[PDB]
């Protein structure tokens, strides 16, 4: 499989196996239990894809944005984050700022998308 | 032509009905839910696969993977003007997973390359 093989790797050693994890997301009571598990997996997948969509990251695994990084979220340089830290440690480190970052991403896409509409209205 | 109307048409005679067929991919009653759930998962795997190849949102997607002559040594006219998609699917079935693997690797390199071109400044 290779699934989660990079879990113990550093952030810059990992994030090259993104398709490995991405492809692993996809008697009446037994049928119901199985359908609930399958429907839930589908709903979670679609919510994550919708979230990437509204940020302007649809169809990508590594998506660049226009949101500046705040030093209050993590006061670390790139060498520590990408060469020493793992993704599990990073997830713990910035858990409390996740929704703030997500909100900013949504707002920047809303401005960018509208700006494109105005640029395409010239001529 | 409607759904599968182009099935007997040549590869270059089809490739114009892709939206027609794309639209058709979407107690005892549990059987219906199973049938409906399966269709959704199958649809999503194909969309996910297109996503990882960088072909999301498209019906025709060009890539940077060279065609290896060992997969099919034909002259393009043979493929697109005479052959149908069913015959083609049979001809290269053995190499489908090889092609898919190459497509995934190609996109990963391009995605990293794109990132490397977006902090030059």
């Amino acid at each position, epitope marked *: 499989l290779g699934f989660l093989g990079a879990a113990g790797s550093t952030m810059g050693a990992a994030s090259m196996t993104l398709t490995v994890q991405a492809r692993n997301l996809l008697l009446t009571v037994w049928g119901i239990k199985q359908l609930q598990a399958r429907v839930l997996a589908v709903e979670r997948y679609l919510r994550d894809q919708q979230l990437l969509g509204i940020w302007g990251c649809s169809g990508k695994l590594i998506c660049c944005t226009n949101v500046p990084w705040n030093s209050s979220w993590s006061n670390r*340089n790139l060498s520590e984050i990408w060469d020493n830290m793992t993704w599990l440690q990073w997830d713990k480190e910035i858990s409390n700022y996740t929704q703030i970052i997500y909100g900013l991403l949504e707002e920047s896409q809303n401005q960018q998308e509208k700006n494109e509409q105005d640029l395409l209205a010239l001529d | 032509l409607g759904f599968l109307g182009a099935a007997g048409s040549t590869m270059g005679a089809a490739s114009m009905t892709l939206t027609v067929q794309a639209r058709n991919l979407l107690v005892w009653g549990i059987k219906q839910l199973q049938a409906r759930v399966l269709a959704v998962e199958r649809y999503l795997r194909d969309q996910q696969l297109l996503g990882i190849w960088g072909c999301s949102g498209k019906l025709i997607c060009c890539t940077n993977v060279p065609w290896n002559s060992s997969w099919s040594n034909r002259n393009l006219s043979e493929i697109w003007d005479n052959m149908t998609w069913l015959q083609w699917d049979k001809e290269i079935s053995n190499y489908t997973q090889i092609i898919y693997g190459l497509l995934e690797e190609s996109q990963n*390199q391009q995605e990293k*390359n794109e990132q*490397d071109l*977006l*902090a030059l*400044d």
Partner: antibody
């Protein structure tokens, strides 16, 4: 760290010359690298830049259609394929480490290490 | 290209400054103005990177700064061992990539 250039020599106008650079003392695949020319009697001129992975190459306009920059990370080497040499290409060609970046590490935009240079006379 | 003095000189113990000028789109746009010290017959050595930072192994006698479209290299306790051609360079955007000035001949009296 060491960078040792090879190749070079005198090639008549219109010919072709391959330069190469052997690196040691650092992880080769972790740094972007470049080739820089110094005219026999003037200053330094940047010629070409290659990323750490080798997938991205950049050239100065004066050589954009004539030079190819290549990297082989399994041998710790750089190479430069120079076609259609003209009198203006006479220079010392230095192998240098630095110049670009890999996005997930601090940027450089400077040259960290230099070799001794190959002398190319047209 | 950038403009530098053809040559400078000074006392072996007093400071010297080597200027470097360019335009608003390169030296005036990016804080990436490195300096190199090239002794005749040798490859250039990195002396200054970014604007003010120096590589490890370089003494604190070499420093520099920029304002507007002008950058300069300041050498404090000028030594006999500093006789070299000094070059400035700058990042000029993701098109040009690098530009250099001519060398400044530093004469040690």
């Amino acid at each position: 760290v060491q960078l040792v250039e090879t190749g070079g020599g005198l090639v008549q106008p219109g010919g072709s010359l391959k330069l190469s650079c052997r690196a040691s003392g650092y992880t080769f695949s972790s740094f972007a690298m470049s080739w820089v020319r110094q005219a026999p009697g003037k200053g330094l001129e940047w010629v070409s830049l290659i990323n750490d992975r080798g997938g991205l190459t950049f050239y100065v306009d004066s050589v954009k259609g004539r030079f190819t920059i290549s990297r082989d990370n399994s041998k710790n080497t750089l190479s430069l394929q120079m076609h259609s040499l003209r009198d203006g290409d006479t220079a010392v060609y230095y192998c240098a480490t630095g110049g670009m970046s890999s996005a997930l590490q601090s940027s450089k935009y400077y040259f960290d290490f230099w070799g001794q240079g190959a002398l190319v006379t047209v | 290209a950038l403009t530098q003095p053809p040559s400078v000189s000074g006392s072996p113990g007093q400071s010297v400054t080597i200027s470097c000028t360019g335009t608003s789109s390169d030296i005036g746009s990016y804080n990436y103005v490195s300096w190199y010290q090239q002794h005749p017959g040798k490859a250039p050595k990195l002396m200054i990177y970014d604007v003010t930072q120096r590589p490890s192994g370089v003494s604190d006698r070499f420093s520099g700064s920029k304002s507007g479209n002008t950058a300069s290299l300041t050498i404090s306790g000028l030594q006999a061992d500093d006789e070299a051609d000094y070059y400035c360079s700058a990042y000029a955007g993701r098109q040009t990539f690098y530009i250099f000035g001519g060398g400044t001949r530093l004469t040690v009296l």
